[PDB]
Amino acid sequence: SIVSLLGIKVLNNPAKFTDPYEFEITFECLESLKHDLEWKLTYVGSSRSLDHDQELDSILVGPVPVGVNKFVFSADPPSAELIPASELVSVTVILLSCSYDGREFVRVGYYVNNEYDEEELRENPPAKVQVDHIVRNILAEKPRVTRFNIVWDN
């Protein structure tokens, strides 16, 4: 495995639900890569409307040099249209994954705590969700990292 992930810093934590996700990704790379790396951010959270995990955003990391590399993934937030209208899902999940030549080799999973900003709104939750009143807290200090054995260069 050529690209090894070292650390991730969730820079804007906690945040408004509607805020863009800001990750500072640091990985090490042992051989020069012929192509781009692709980082993907997926929203995962319990809903009745069957659901197929929300792909929040994608980003390409340019010509990958050898050594330790740092970058910022500014992912777009989830659309209000694609989250329960009747219930605030208190605990959701965000999946940060990386691909090379169209194959994922790394997946990082985080739990996210979601609650209303107002002291009373938390106690008397409205019939319909106030998206502009949710505050997310990514449990960034505790992620689950998964490696997939993939074909690199040839």
């Binding site: 980003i59 390409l60 990391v61 040099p65 330790v68 590399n69 970058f71 500014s74």
Partner: peptide, 19 residues
């Protein structure tokens, strides 16, 4: 699909960078 500039740590300013 958007691109991100990649920073090779070791070489330029970091704390002192304006970007």
């Amino acid at each position: 699909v958007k691109r991100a500039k990649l920073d090779q740590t070791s070489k330029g300013p970091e704390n002192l960078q304006f970007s």
